[PDB]
RNA sequence: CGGGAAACCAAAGUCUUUGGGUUCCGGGGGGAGUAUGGUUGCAAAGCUGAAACUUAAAGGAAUUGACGGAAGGGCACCACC
């Protein structure tokens, strides 16, 4: 049918505020490090700019008295090519439900990505800010800054996540069992995620505090709301 | 982060732990922001003014946040440098 | 604080001495040691009574700093605190929970009991361990009443006291309700209060 | 043999007692008539089983509380153990003794002057 | 993989410990691997005591105890039901059974 | 105990081969 | 046995920084340790420090500010020439924008950026970032 | 604490943010601790020690089943008294 409103009504304090008042970006949700549990919050802020990618579909099974019982597991990545990326996984009895479930978890997992410069500071930033790494299982992944216009030097799996994150130039390295695509994807997303929590000399000045959104809008949640 | 024209280029600037001087990440759901009331000096009553602190999740789970909040409240005037 | 209008009076010190609040256990955890006066000749620790009043005023200054009183949540799963948390939540408009806490009340968004508070107060860290460990998923600050052998693992204000049972638990909740009502402006800092401490105590022999 | 009652019987009996406690009693043949007019029950054989467990529950409720059931008559006397008791007209009075190390702790806090004192044993009790 | 932290033996801070011979089968095993049982009982059973007290020559006598100490290997202790196998977390409990 | 018996089997074969060759010259 | 004192001093600071402690005690003291600490302090990575006399080599107490990611030692004191210094800072540093190698030279103990202004080579001691 | 494939380990930690000193020693599974030379011993034997040829896996930790002349509860005249 026709796409009218009221397909969503909030079930959390953050959802009640995002639908109504001047919460103006995801960055003021990240600043207070709040959990996101309604998928419609990220469609409100990023929306149709997000593009979607199925990395692998994988069968898994358990033994029973009668037969082997099979489920399908889908790996999905999502991003806007300008500083946001997410990864998600679900396992179901049918492939179409596994993909549809994986997209919701890939939206709830989105993080902010930091970018910087290899050389002199001309224009806008285009590479990782410093040498970083991430782990999952035995797999280790490592990212290194590069001069302007090299592109990404990597295997296929890490290249697709770095492209969706909006990084132009990068040198990369890996170790142990990369043939397991799930641990290779999570080790890459762990390295990308750490870029905004590495203490660097431009972040050394003293922090200035403000009230949180639940404190600024403390009466809006009471006077006409439940 | 600034470029050679002097303009800023970060998405946002993240907060740091008041006890420890380390960055609090976007998914650190064990972290907190504490808020504490000031009182007037003639009658011990709330005037609507307040002070705030932020604590890292790693310092909370090792049990050090109670002593950290106390040191911060003695460094500010609230506990008045005697005990 | 230093101020005379916030100083501990003789009549409060006699009420502490009368209820056993200053008497700890036979054991001490290394995080509680700064709250202790001495160990007796019989193996029992003495809690320092001036340390309690500073930490209780710091807790009241956190509770007053919340602009909607229903955003504060109050808990006791042991019986000795159940009458006390019900009276505390009547005197000032917090949300009480008494008896069994259901796992997932703070994190299962769909659940019939689901709630999302701004401050959490608990009667005993070892007994009330579910809402303490569950607060670590949702950015929720914590206040607790601690004995000499209490494990400090998620509490941000610990108040030194005997929390074993009887008159000592009820007195602490009554005195916390008195000072939050005083410094918010609802009762006098000099005239005695109309609510007797004995209203908060648990089940002395009735007849 | 087996005479255990299934959850369809046990839940319907509790919901009847919560709403209609003032109509009910110890006579099975009167309870059997009440349960037929306050509820729609598809079978005569199910109606007899529900009125049977209702008759068992009334004889329990006459002795004390049943954890799944609540009534005004039992809540208002709980509310009378709540509020204040008839036990005493004043608190247990603050005239209590002090040990020498608590006397020293109070001396450093600028207080005392209202308590008697005595010493403990010569060596730690075994 | 290793099943027990103590290797199933009491030996720590030592090289060699002397053997003993079992009370059922005379197998040879270390004094600190062997499963212990010290039994104290009456010479006369709880059924028989009344029949032997009434034929006694004395106006007061108390029937004596019998003392025996027993040693088993793992195979005899399991087969004679002196010990049972246990759950992976229950194996850690060192407290003896209740009375 | 198959490895200990394969070790014993090799020792008796080597004792035969020893005595056979050292007789020749 | 204790074959090198500068490696103890930096490993002791590095373990204290990771536990979140506000002070650390270094023992034994040395002329090399006091000159290395001074280079970190001048660039803003540690607070001020105090030396205790005991008639047996002495001790140092240092104040920590939470900014330091790592400090470390290269054990053989390899020689470096100005043409080869690029290879060492490509190996050891996290970015071209921050962090320092520390060298000993006949003009003194110094920062690898100062050795280029003074046109001098030397031996490697360690690094920080 | 932190580490690891995990079982587990206050060391088996302070490691891609990789350098305290120093000795012995491993390189897919077999043929093989074999043949041949040397050497020590009364003898049994110890020490040192190959190649031709052959092969797609051999192996470690853990999960769900099935199975036991393993243990503990309970049941059935298509089981027994």
Curated annotation (Swiss-Prot), chain B:
There is a cross-link at residue 41 (Glycyl lysine isopeptide (Lys-Gly) (interchain with G-Cter in SUMO2)). This is Small ribosomal subunit protein eS21. One of its GO terms (biological process) is endonucleolytic cleavage in ITS1 to separate SSU-rRNA from 5.8S rRNA and LSU-rRNA from tricistronic rRNA transcript (SSU-rRNA, 5.8S rRNA, LSU-rRNA). It comes from the Eukaryota. One of its GO terms (molecular function) is structural constituent of ribosome. The modification N-acetylmethionine is found at residue 1. It is found in: Cytoplasm, Cytosol; Cytoplasm; Rough endoplasmic reticulum. It comes from Bos taurus.
From Swiss-Prot, chain C:
GO terms for molecular function: laminin binding; laminin receptor activity; structural constituent of ribosome; virus receptor activity. The modification Phosphothreonine is found at residue 95. The record marks 113-114, 131-132 as: Cleavage. One of its GO terms (cellular component) is plasma membrane. Residues 52-111 are annotated as: Interaction with PPP1R16B. Acylated. Acylation may be a prerequisite for conversion of the monomeric 37 kDa laminin receptor precursor (37LRP) to the mature dimeric 67 kDa laminin receptor (67LR), and may provide a mechanism for membrane association. Cleaved by stromelysin-3 (ST3) at the cell surface. Cleavage by stromelysin-3 may be a mechanism to alter cell-extracellular matrix interactions. GO terms for biological process: ribosomal small subunit assembly; translation. Keywords: Acetylation, Cell membrane, Cytoplasm, Host cell receptor for virus entry, Host-virus interaction, Isopeptide bond, Membrane, Nucleus, Phosphoprotein, Receptor, Repeat, Ribonucleoprotein, Ribosomal protein, Ubl conjugation. It is found in: Cell membrane; Cytoplasm; Nucleus. Coiled coil: none annotated. There is a cross-link at residue 87 (Glycyl lysine isopeptide (Lys-Gly) (interchain with G-Cter in SUMO2)). It comes from the Eukaryota. The modification N6-acetyllysine is found at residues 50, 87. The modification Phosphoserine is found at residue 41. Residues 159-178 are annotated as: Laminin-binding. This is Small ribosomal subunit protein uS2. It comes from Oryctolagus cuniculus. The lineage of its organism: Eukaryota, Metazoa, Chordata, Craniata, Vertebrata. The chain holds residues 3 to 209 of 295 of the full protein.
Swiss-Prot record, chain D:
Component of the small ribosomal subunit. Part of the small subunit (SSU) processome, composed of more than 70 proteins and the RNA chaperone small nucleolar RNA (snoRNA) U3. The keyword Cell inner membrane does not apply. Component of the small ribosomal subunit. The ribosome is a large ribonucleoprotein complex responsible for the synthesis of proteins in the cell. Part of the small subunit (SSU) processome, first precursor of the small eukaryotic ribosomal subunit. During the assembly of the SSU processome in the nucleolus, many ribosome biogenesis factors, an RNA chaperone and ribosomal proteins associate with the nascent pre-rRNA and work in concert to generate RNA folding, modifications, rearrangements and cleavage as well as targeted degradation of pre-ribosomal RNA by the RNA exosome. SUPFAM superfamilies: Rps17e-like. The modification N6-succinyllysine is found at residue 19. This is Small ribosomal subunit protein eS17. The gene is RPS17. Belongs to the eukaryotic ribosomal protein eS17 family. Keywords: Cytoplasm, Isopeptide bond, Nucleus, Phosphoprotein, Ribonucleoprotein, Ribosomal protein, Ubl conjugation. Ubiquitinated at Lys-103 by RNF14 and RNF25 in response to ribosome collisions (ribosome stalling). It comes from Oryctolagus cuniculus (Rabbit).
Curated annotation (Swiss-Prot), chain G:
It holds the Pfam family Ribosomal_S8. Keywords: Cytoplasm, Nucleus, Ribonucleoprotein, Ribosomal protein. It comes from Oryctolagus cuniculus (Rabbit). This is Small ribosomal subunit protein uS8. The gene is RPS15A. HAMAP family: Ribosomal_uS8_A. GO terms for cellular component: cytosolic ribosome; nucleolus; ribonucleoprotein complex. NCBIfam families: PRK04034.1 (NF003115). Component of the small ribosomal subunit. Part of the small subunit (SSU) processome, first precursor of the small eukaryotic ribosomal subunit. During the assembly of the SSU processome in the nucleolus, many ribosome biogenesis factors, an RNA chaperone and ribosomal proteins associate with the nascent pre-rRNA and work in concert to generate RNA folding, modifications, rearrangements and cleavage as well as targeted degradation of pre-ribosomal RNA by the RNA exosome. Required for proper erythropoiesis. The lineage of its organism: Eukaryota, Metazoa, Chordata, Craniata, Vertebrata. Belongs to the universal ribosomal protein uS8 family.
């Amino acid at each position: 049918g026709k796409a009218e409103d009221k397909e969503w009504l909030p079930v959390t304090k953050l959802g009640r505020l995002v639908k109504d008042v001047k919460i103006k970006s995801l960055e003021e949700i990240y600043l207070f490090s709040l959990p996101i549990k309604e998928s419609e919050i990220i469609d409100f802020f990023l929306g149709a700019a997000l593009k979607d990618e199925v990395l692998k579909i994988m069968p898994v099974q358990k033994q029973t008295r009668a037969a082997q019982r099979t489920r399908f597991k889908a790996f999905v990545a999502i991003g806007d090519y300008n500083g946001h990326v997410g990864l998600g996984v679900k396992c179901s009895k049918e492939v179409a439900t596994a993909i549809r479930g994986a997209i919701i978890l890939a939206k709830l997992s989105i993080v902010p990505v930091r970018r910087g410069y290899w050389g002199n500071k001309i224009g806008k930033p285009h590479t990782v800010p410093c040498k970083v790494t991430g782990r999952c299982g035995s797999v280790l992944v490592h990212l290194i800054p590069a001069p302007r216009g090299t592109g990404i030097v990597s295997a296929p799996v890490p290249k697709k996540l770095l492209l969706m994150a909006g990084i132009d130039d990068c040198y990369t390295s890996a170790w142990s069992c990369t043939a397991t695509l799930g641990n290779f994807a999570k080790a890459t997303f762990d390295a990308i995620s750490k870029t905004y929590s590495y203490l660097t000399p431009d972040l050394w000045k003293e922090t200035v505090f403000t009230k949180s959104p639940y404190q600024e809008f403390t009466d809006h949640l009471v006077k006409t709301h439940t | 982060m600034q470029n050679d024209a002097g303009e800023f280029v970060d998405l946002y600037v993240p907060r740091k732990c008041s006890a420890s001087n380390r960055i609090i990440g976007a998914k650190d759901h064990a972290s907190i922001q504490m808020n504490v009331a000031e009182v007037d000096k003639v009658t011990g009553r709330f005037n609507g003014q307040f002070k705030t602190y932020a604590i890292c999740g790693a310092i909370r789970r090792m049990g050090e946040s109670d002593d950290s909040i106390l040191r911060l409240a003695k460094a500010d005037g609230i506990v008045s440098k005697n005990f | 604080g230093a101020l005379d209008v916030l100083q501990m009076k003789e009549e409060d010190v006699l009420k502490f001495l009368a209820a056993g609040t200053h008497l700890g256990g036979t054991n001490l955890d290394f995080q509680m040691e700064q709250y202790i006066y001495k160990r007796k000749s019989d193996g029992i620790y003495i809690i320092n009574l001036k340390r309690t009043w500073e930490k209780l005023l710091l807790a009241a200054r956190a509770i007053v700093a919340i602009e909607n009183p229903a955003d504060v949540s109050v808990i006791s799963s042991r019986n000795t605190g159940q009458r006390a948390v019900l009276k505390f939540a009547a005197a000032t408009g917090a949300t009480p929970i008494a008896g069994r806490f259901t796992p997932g009340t703070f994190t299962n968004q769909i659940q019939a009991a689901f709630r999302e508070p701004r401050l959490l107060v608990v009667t005993d860290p070892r007994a009330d361990h579910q809402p303490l460990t569950e607060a670590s998923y949702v950015n929720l600050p914590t206040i607790a009443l601690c004995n000499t052998d209490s494990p400090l693992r998620y509490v941000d204000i610990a108040i030194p006291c005997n929390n074993k049972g009887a008159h000592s638990v009820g007195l602490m909740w009554w005195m916390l309700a008195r000072e939050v009502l005083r410094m918010r402006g609802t009762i006098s800092r000099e005239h005695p209060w109309e609510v007797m401490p004995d209203l908060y105590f648990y089940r002395d022999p009735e007849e | 043999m087996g005479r255990v009652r299934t959850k369809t019987v046990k839940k319907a009996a509790r919901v009847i007692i919560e709403k209609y406690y003032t109509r009910l009693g110890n006579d099975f043949h009167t309870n059997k008539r009440v349960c037929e007019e306050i509820a729609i029950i598809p079978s005569k054989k199910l109606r007899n089983k529900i009125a049977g467990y209702v008759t068992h529950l009334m004889k329990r409720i006459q002795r004390g509380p049943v954890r799944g059931i609540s009534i005004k008559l039992q809540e208002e006397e709980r509310e009378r153990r709540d509020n204040y008791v008839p036990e005493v007209s004043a608190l247990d009075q603050e005239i209590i003794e002090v040990d020498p190390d608590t006397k020293e702790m109070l001396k450093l806090l600028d207080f005392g002057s209202l308590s008697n004192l005595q010493v403990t044993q010569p060596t730690v009790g075994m | 993989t290793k099943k027990r932290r103590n290797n199933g033996r009491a030996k720590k801070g030592r090289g060699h410990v002397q053997p003993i011979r079992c009370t059922n089968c005379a197998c040879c095993v270390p004094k600190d691997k062997a499963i212990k049982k010290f039994v104290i009982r009456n010479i006369v059973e709880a059924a028989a005591v009344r029949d032997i007290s009434e034929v006694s020559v004395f106006d007061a006598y108390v029937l004596p105890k019998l003392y025996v100490k027993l040693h088993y290997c793992v195979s005899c202790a399991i087969h004679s039901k002196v010990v049972r196998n246990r759950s992976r977390e229950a194996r850690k409990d060192r407290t003896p059974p209740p009375r | 105990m198959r490895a200990k018996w394969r070790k014993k089997r090799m020792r008796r074969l080597k004792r035969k081969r020893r005595k056979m060759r050292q007789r020749s010259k | 046995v204790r074959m090198n004192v500068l490696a103890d001093a930096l490993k002791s600071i590095n373990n204290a920084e990771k536990r979140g402690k506000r002070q650390v005690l270094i023992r034994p003291c040395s002329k090399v340790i006091v000159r290395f600490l001074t280079v970190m302090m001048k660039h803003g990575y540690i607070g001020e420090f105090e030396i205790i006399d005991d008639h047996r080599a002495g001790k140092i107490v240092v104040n920590l500010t939470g900014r330091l990611n790592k400090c470390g030692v290269i054990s053989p004191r390899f020689d470096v020439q100005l043409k080869d210094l690029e290879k060492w800072q490509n190996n050891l540093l996290p970015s071209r924008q921050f962090g320092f190698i520390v060298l000993t030279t006949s003009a003194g103990i110094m920062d690898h950026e100062e050795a280029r202004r003074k046109h001098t080579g030397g031996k490697i001691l360690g690094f920080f970032f």
